[PDB]
Amino acid sequence: EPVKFKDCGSWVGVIKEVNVSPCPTQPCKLHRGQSYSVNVTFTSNTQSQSSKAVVHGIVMGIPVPFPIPESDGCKSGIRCPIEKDKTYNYVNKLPVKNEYPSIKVVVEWELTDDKNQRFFCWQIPIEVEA
């Protein structure tokens, strides 16, 4: 489902939609042991040979790197080279491990280009539980 998000600095890209599934109500509640589909539709404002995704889980106010299956954007539904003014659907999974504590977390997800400029940067509040 499309979710409400806060843009944290998209600069060389424009976010059209952030879709997390399954997420029938918000803030999305994520169950420990389950993985969620993330589909970010954005339009590029530049070109780039590569793209890298970095995710952080802001817990108790502290941003901590968040493990994801693939950090190479070009292996995440984006056919690189990324070209200017083209629309892409970045797709990945947000794994909620069984060991993760049951608390509120703000997930920050960004995709950067060859110069580390952000195609997109967004944050969404989530609730982790059993």
Ligand X SMILES: *[C@@H]1O[C@H](CO)[C@@H](O)[C@H](O)[C@H]1NC(C)=O
Query: Using CB under 6 A as the criterion, which residues of the chain lie in contact with ligand X when the complex forms?
Result: 19, 39, 41, 89, 91
> Can you give the three-state secondary structure of 25-94, one letter per residue?
CCCEEEECCCEEEEEEEEEECCCECCCEEEEEEEECCEEEECCCCCCEHHHCCCCCCECCCCEEEEEEEE
Residue whose Cβ sits closest to ligand X: 39
Rg (CA), the chain: 14
Q: How far is the CB of 41 from ligand X (least distance, A)?
A: 5
Which one, 19 or 45, has the nearer CB to ligand X? Answer: 19
Q: Cβ of residue 54: shortest distance to ligand X, in angstroms?
A: 21
Nearest approach, Cβ of 20 to ligand X (angstroms)? 11
* CB of 48 or CB of 76, closer to ligand X: 76
Min dist. Cβ of residue 10 to ligand X (A): 17
Q: Please, what is the end-to-end C-alpha distance for the chain in angstroms?
A: 21
The C-alpha atoms of residue 37 and residue 35 are separated, in whole angstroms, by: 7
| Identity of the residue, 41 or 47, whose beta carbon is nearer to ligand X in the bound complex | 41
Nearer to ligand X, 55 or 100 (CB): 55
